Design a protein around this ligand. Structure first.
Ligand SMILES: Nc1ncnc2c1ncn2[C@@H]1O[C@H](COP(=O)(O)OP(=O)(O)CP(=O)(O)O)[C@@H](O)[C@H]1O
Ligand SMILES: [Mg+2]
Ligand SMILES: [Mg+2]
Lengths: 20, 336
């Protein structure tokens, strides 16, 4: 499922902003 | 609203033109615990000695900021934050600087990030997501009317107060501009395709971000996700969006108009502006005035035990605040 794929991904924790 | 916005503007312009500075100093606060870390510093829970009140102190390293060419953004952040006033915007209580750092002392929002609750719970029911969304809609209407673009909408920047309402923090990328701008900034999952494409953009990016937010709150995951930002960008630009089976027909329709690549079709950027969103069927049960007045029944109220409680925030590695005996980057931050 999409949920399971998200949960196993590397971006489930706090996301940092980017600049420039 | 037009009457209200006109007065809000006058109030804003006065502060924008003559910002407050140096309204406190470091030794007036006892630093307790880090609530979060950033590229140029961190945010700490602190207790103001004289009043005993708790606040969140964002600390910025001057040399760092200058080295990484983020002076303008940092100055924007504080100039704007000290000038705005709205029920869903965190208030800047004090601001000051020293030899090494810049400090922004905000009201402490003990409920924690929407992020943690969202991840823990999995996803918010539509009425719950809608409650939060209405608040952001009114906040963007307010900010936009002042020629301000927020630029970093995400659950991590949305705090839940004791009433269960949203308090927007992190104006790091907020900017006052009439027309378009070009800076590549924001958070990967929330970037509108025009930002990624380096074509120049406007307030419309905040409405696309709202689309991503509503989708994430209701689904429990972002509409465009992957392991690396670059993979995320490809998905965003492709435009293809898929909705969970549980999404209502209304939600899907609103989302298709927000996560709209075509600027001439994106809700919030049309002739009727914000009214296209406010009047959408998904918001039919939303009493806008009641929301603004904070009179609506909050779907969830975070558990809090006494002021100074940080149980709603993750733990971070503590570090000593260093203050040089020599002034660093004084001219660069004169207006701060
Ligand atoms: N007024 C406040 N009350 C309680 N917590 C706060 C707060 N202001 C900020 N925080 C907490 O500190 C964290 C970091 O603050 P902020 O987002 O302003 O820093 P930053 O801009 O360096 C991170 P980034 O740019 O990567 O998103 C927030 O995500 C939140 O958890
Ligand atoms: Mg942030
Ligand atoms: Mg930021």
């Amino acid at each position: 499922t999409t949920y399971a794929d998200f949960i196993a991904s590397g971006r489930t924790g706090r996301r940092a902003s980017i600049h420039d | 609203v037009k009457e209200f916005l006109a007065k809000a503007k006058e109030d804003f312009l006065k502060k924008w033109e003559t910002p407050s500075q140096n309204t406190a100093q470091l030794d007036q606060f006892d630093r307790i615990k880090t609530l979060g870390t950033g590229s140029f510093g961190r945010v700490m829970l602190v207790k103001h000695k004289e009043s005993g009140n708790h606040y969140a102190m964002k600390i910025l390293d001057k040399q760092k900021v200058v080295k990484l060419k983020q002076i303008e953004h940092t100055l924007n952040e504080k100039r704007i934050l000290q000038a705005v006033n709205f029920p869903f915007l965190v208030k800047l209580e004090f601001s000051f600087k020293d030899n090494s750092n810049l400090y922004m002392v905000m009201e402490y929002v003990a409920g924690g990030e929407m992020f943690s609750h969202l991840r823990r719970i999995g996803r918010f029911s539509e009425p719950h997501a809608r409650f939060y969304a209405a608040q952001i809609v009114l906040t963007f209407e307010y900010l936009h009317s002042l020629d301000l673009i927020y630029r970093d909408l995400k659950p991590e920047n949305l705090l839940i107060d004791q009433q269960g309402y949203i308090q927007v923090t992190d104006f790091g990328f907020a900017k006052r501009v009439k027309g378009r701008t070009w800076t590549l900034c924001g958070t990967p999952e929330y970037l509108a395709p025009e930002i990624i494409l380096s074509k120049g953009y406007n307030k419309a990016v905040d409405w696309w971000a709202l689309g991503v937010l509503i989708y994430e709150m209701a689904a429990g995951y972002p509409p465009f996700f992957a392991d690396q930002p670059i993979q995320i960008y490809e998905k965003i630009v492709s435009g293809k969006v898929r909705f969970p089976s549980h999404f209502s027909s209304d939600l899907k329709d609103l989302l298709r108009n927000l996560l709209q690549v075509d600027l001439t079709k994106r809700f919030g950027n049309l002739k009727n502006g914000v009214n296209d969103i406010k009047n959408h069927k998904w918001f039919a049960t939303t009493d806008w005035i009641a929301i603004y007045q904070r009179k609506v029944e909050a779907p969830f109220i975070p558990k809090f035990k006494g002021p100074g409680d940080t149980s709603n925030f993750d733990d971070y590695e503590e570090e000593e605040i260093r203050v040089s005996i020599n002034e660093k980057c004084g001219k660069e931050f004169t207006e701060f």
